[PDB]
Write a protein that binds this ligand. Structure first.
Ligand code: NA
Ligand code: NA
Lengths: 103, 99, 99, 103
């Protein structure tokens, strides 16, 4: 009984958004997106995470992320939709753009 | 040095961080921290990040909004060392500011 | 709206953040925060940074190791607004965790 | 009665170090170095500061820095030397490298 509508698996809109974040992987049923970010060291990873934290609390949409030294393993979904929404893709895009500074 | 499962030093160190739990084989210690919101959780993580890079010993941590699920072990030791317990203690002290 | 010097609303808001001082012309409010070390100071600043970008209202702050010298004013108002006092209050509450 | 030796003004070594951080300005008497960093917004500035904070506490050498939204105005010196030391230039270099990710 999720109160929000999720993007349907394979919907034209979901695919349109996924095109903007091509390094992310759609999970089974298209209920989330995943990306594992890799950096040189923790100092870089933390600089990346710090920007994402500011964005996440601004838009009130937070990553499920696992950091181990120089890697940040991320899964995004909207709990209140039981699946993906526009907000997940917007967060993924911000994260992609923040990570680009390190490549 | 790697701390052997149930070793005197391991058991002694564990008493200093009693809210942590030993995992199978005593290969790591775990604690899940809970805060009021992400803002608090991030303030906590920020202090830990500074400490971690200072001592060059890093947590395996999973953050979801107001929770931080932490597992500590020494990567090149294939188990626990003094550094894990020192990190746990710092984390405990950092979290106490939010109680 | 810009709060006029000595205005009823300004004086009322100032009572909520009594450790801050009004500057000349009541153009800004100031407080210098002191912590035990940089690690604490940074934990404090980190929470404030999240809040600042959330509400889109930012401190003028000077950090030297364990001290954070802060002046708040609303850049496009040429004086103080409600947002400055709201930011001051958040900062006060964040600092209290280190007392 | 500073317990540490400072780099003398115009010393060959001071100049050798300054060459590595050319966007920094030597102040009067060569007692400090200054640089004002500019970013697109606070989110970027914070990502920059976050990396520098980690470095600073690792080496126990901290910037005197003033942040206003997207700008970070920095002055570096070693109090215990009453002037510049190798540590100031090392910090400046780290900061330069962290800022380069945003240009
Ligand atoms: Na979520
Ligand atoms: Na200094």
């Amino acid at each position: 009984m999720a109160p929000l509508a999720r993007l349907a698996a394979n919907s034209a809109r979901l695919l349109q958004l996924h095109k903007t974040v091509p390094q992310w992987h759609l999970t089974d049923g298209h209920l989330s997106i995943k990306r594992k970010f890799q950096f040189s060291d923790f100092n870089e990873a933390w600089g990346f995470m710090s920007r994402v934290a500011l964005y996440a609390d601004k838009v009130d949409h937070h990553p499920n992320w696992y950091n181990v030294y120089n890697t940040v393993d991320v899964e995004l979904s909207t709990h209140d939709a039981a699946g993906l929404t526009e907000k997940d893709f917007a967060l993924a895009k911000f994260m992609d753009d923040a990570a680009k500074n390190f490549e």
